[PDB]
Amino acid sequence: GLMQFTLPVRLCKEIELFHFDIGPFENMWPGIFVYMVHRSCGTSCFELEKLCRFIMSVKKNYRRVPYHNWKHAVTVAHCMYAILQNNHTLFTDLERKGLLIACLCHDLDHRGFSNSYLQKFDHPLAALYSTSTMEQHHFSQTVSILQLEGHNIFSTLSSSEYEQVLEIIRKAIIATDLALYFGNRKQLEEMYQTGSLNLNNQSHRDRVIGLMMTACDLCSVTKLWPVTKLTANDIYAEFWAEGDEMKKLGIQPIPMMDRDKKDEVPQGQLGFYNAVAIPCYTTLTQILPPTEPLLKACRDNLSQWEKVIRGEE
Ligand SMILES: Cc1nc2ccccc2nc1CC[C@H]1CCN(c2ccccn2)C1
Ligand SMILES: [Mg+2]
Ligand SMILES: [Zn+2]
């Protein structure tokens, strides 16, 4: 009850900033998350014992893959924390609860393979869930963990509030399927620019949370350049393993997954900054002005990839 989490001074200051890196000390990441729930949501939001047990079961159900791992979960939850803390009054009590949990759970039990590889492999998950295959599985794994004995962090919510929170989490997790991002952002762009965007309209709120979820998920592109560059190595370590698995099914992978085409990474990152990242943070900044530092940091990293192409690194 009277038991705050406190971080060392550098972390207590830097954790408030969008570009914070949670560091390489895995044993501190639960503490960093509880810290973020307590300041974001309240010390009263969750029973500490239940929250701690939930967090450690979530950790156990992330695998030792190079990128879609526990560190990614916590990283994506911190970007959400920074967005919530910079937009105090725009979000409901239930959204503040749901969204940090959604972020921590959003890639539960990821294997390091795309939806497209599961479909080509004919994985059982591709028969159970025909679109957003991994994302329906992540939501399914989240409900499983919520139902383990002593793991119900939502136990004090009413039946209908509990249903609303699980519905915020489900949509937030589905929204991380980048195939859905393009259309979501076009609609948000048209709504904002024809002045029809209405944050009292639930279906609008849903779109805006989806875009937040894309922004938090891609937040590697919003770090200081040395973090961006070293995270890129983990991202490609996954993609190139999938490429290898595609070649074992007798399928030429796309170039982003082909290790024979490493030379094309700089230009491939550029396309991605221009086609996905910059548009994402631009629309997010229009809807939520205090998220502008995410857009500024992405533009800084775009210019760093331009420098790599020009042989100045
Ligand atoms: C899909 C993706 N998600 C990210 C999320 C966070 C940070 C960086 C990310 N980079 C990518 C890869 C973009 C792709 C677009 C094509 N591209 C290529 C193409 C050829 C060779 C290498 N990369 C890379
Ligand atoms: Mg995912
Ligand atoms: Zn993710």
Q: What is the residue extent of each domain of the chain?
A: 28-310
**CA quadruple 97, 28, 52, 73: dihedral sign:** positive
Closest by Cα among 235, 217, 249 to 118: 249
Q: Assign 112 to helix, strand or coil.
A: coil
DSSP one-letter string for 114-155? -HHHHHHHT-HHHHH-SSSHHHHHHHHHHHHHHTSTT--TTT
At 188, list the tokens: 């948000």
Residue type, 68: H
Q: Cα–Cα distance between 297 and 29 in angstroms, integer?
A: 23
Q: Cα–Cα distance between 300 and 298 in angstroms, integer?
A: 5
Which residues, 6+ apart, have CB-to-CB distance to 174 below 8 Å?
132, 135, 136, 139, 180
Contact 109, 137 (CB under 8 A): yes
In angstroms and rounded to an integer, the radius of gyration of the C-alpha atoms of the chain is 19
197 C-beta closer than 6 A to ligand 1: no
183 C-beta closer than 6 A to ligand 1: no
Residue type, 287: I
Strands (E), the chain: none
Residue nearest to atom 15 of ligand 1 (CA): 268
220 C-beta closer than 6 A to ligand 1: yes
Q: What is the DSSP letter of 254?
A: P
Rounded distance from Cα 268 to ligand 1 centre (Å): 6
For the chain, give me the number of helices (H) and strands (E)?
Answer: 15, 0
Q: Cα–Cα distance between 131 and 114 in angstroms, integer?
A: 12
Q: Quick count: other Cβ atoms within 10 Å of Cβ 263?
A: 9
> Which burial class, exposed, middle or buried, applies to 99 when counting CB atoms under 10 A from its CB (0-12, 13-18, 19+)?
buried
Q: Cα–Cα distance between 165 and 96 in angstroms, integer?
A: 10
Which residues, 6+ apart, have CB-to-CB distance to 291 below 8 Å?
18, 83, 86, 87, 215, 281, 284, 285
266 C-beta closer than 6 A to ligand 1: no
Q: Quick count: other Cβ atoms within 10 Å of Cβ 17?
A: 11
Contact 103, 76 (CB under 8 A): yes
Contact 5, 38 (CB under 8 A): yes
Question: Which parts are annotated binding residues?
Answer: 68, 72, 106-107, 217, 269
Closest by Cα among 311, 277, 310 to 79: 277
Contact 185, 264 (CB under 8 A): no
221 C-beta closer than 6 A to ligand 1: yes
Rounded distance from Cα 5 to ligand 2 centre (Å): 29
Which positions are annotated as active-site residues?
A: 68
- How far does Cα 159 stand from its chain's mean position? 27
Which residues, 6+ apart, have CB-to-CB distance to 190 below 8 Å?
196
Q: Assign 250 to helix, strand or coil.
A: coil
Contact 151, 57 (CB under 8 A): yes
Question: Which parts are annotated binding residues for a divalent metal cation?
Answer: 72, 106-107, 217
Contact 46, 153 (CB under 8 A): yes
Contact 29, 22 (CB under 8 A): yes
Q: Quick count: other Cβ atoms within 10 Å of Cβ 300?
A: 16
Which residues, 6+ apart, have CB-to-CB distance to 79 below 8 Å?
18, 103, 215, 216, 219, 222, 294
Class of domain 28-310: mainly alpha
Q: What is the DSSP letter of 46?
A: S
At 182, list the tokens: 């393009």
Q: Assign 61 to helix, strand or coil.
A: coil
At 148, list the tokens: 């383990």
Rounded distance from Cα 308 to ligand 2 centre (Å): 28
